[PDB]
Amino acid sequence: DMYIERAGDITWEKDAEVTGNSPRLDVALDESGDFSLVE
Amino acid sequence: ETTDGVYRVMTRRLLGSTQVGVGVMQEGVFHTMWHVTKGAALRSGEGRLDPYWGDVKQDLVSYCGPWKLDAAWDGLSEVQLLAVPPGERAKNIQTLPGIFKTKDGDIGAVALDYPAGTSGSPILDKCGRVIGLYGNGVVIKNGSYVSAITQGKRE
Numbered sequence: 001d002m003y004i005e006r007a008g009d010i011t012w013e014k015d016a017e018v019t020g021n022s023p024r025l026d027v028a029l030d031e032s033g034d035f036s037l038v039e
Numbered sequence: 040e041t042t043d044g045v046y047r048v049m050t051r052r053l054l055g056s057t058q059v060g061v062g063v064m065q066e067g068v069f070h071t072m073w074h075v076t077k078g079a080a081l082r083s084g085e086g087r088l089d090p091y092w093g094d095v096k097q098d099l100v101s102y103c104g105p106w107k108l109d110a111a112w113d114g115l116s117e118v119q120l121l122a123v124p125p126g127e128r129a130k131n132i133q134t135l136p137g138i139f140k141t142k143d144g145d146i147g148a149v150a151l152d153y154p155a156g157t158s159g160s161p162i163l164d165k166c167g168r169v170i171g172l173y174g175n176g177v178v179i180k181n182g183s184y185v186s187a188i189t190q191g192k193r194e
């Protein structure tokens with residue numbers, strides 16, 4: 001049986017770790033909710 | 040506990056307490072990804088949260104009421120993933136989203152890799168508004184993981 005626990009407030013934090021790239025991808029979404037790449 | 044904020048979704052079905060995902064509590068409605076709970080009921084102390092709406096294609100589910108989150112990525116600015124990893128404290132990560140181009144339109148995407156149990160963590164704009172949830176994405180030719188910015192529809 002599942003249960004929930006509070007993990008924090010939802011706020012924007014100034015001076016957070018800035019990381020991660022911005023890739024433009026050609027994708028497809030199937031009936032099961034699965035994303036896949038189209039090439 | 041119905042206080043607004045970010046929550047861990049846990050299970051005692053496996054060895055110890057295992058974190059299967061994360062969710063957002065807003066306006067008395069709990070929002071998470073469908074693959075975290077599979078539509079199952081949730082416990083919050085003595086209280087029970089029953090599912091209200093869900094969709095396997097969108098990979099979203101809401102508890103106690105209809106989907107409340109309606110803010111969207113502006114397609115220009117950086118965003119923050121408030122990542123809640125298993126066994127670790129909540130952490131904000133700022134990134135500029137990429138794009139998923141589909142036959143039905145473009146969707147924002149965040150190129151951050153985190154454990155499976157981080158699914159449902161909220162993505163926020165500079166005002167702290169939840170513009171979507173992390174956890175439904177794809178694995179690119181790099182081997183890395185890129186998640187869509189998944190947002191529901193508020194009626």
Ligand SMILES: Cc1nc(CNC(=O)c2[nH]c([C@H]3CCCNC3)nc2C)c[nH]1
Binds near residue numbers: 176
């Ligand atoms: C590598 C990595 N994945 C994440 C987040 N996503 C998952 O873990 C995940 N996604 C799905 C399917 C099921 C429903 C349709 N969407 C995809 N199953 C799982 C377990 C973080 N890091």
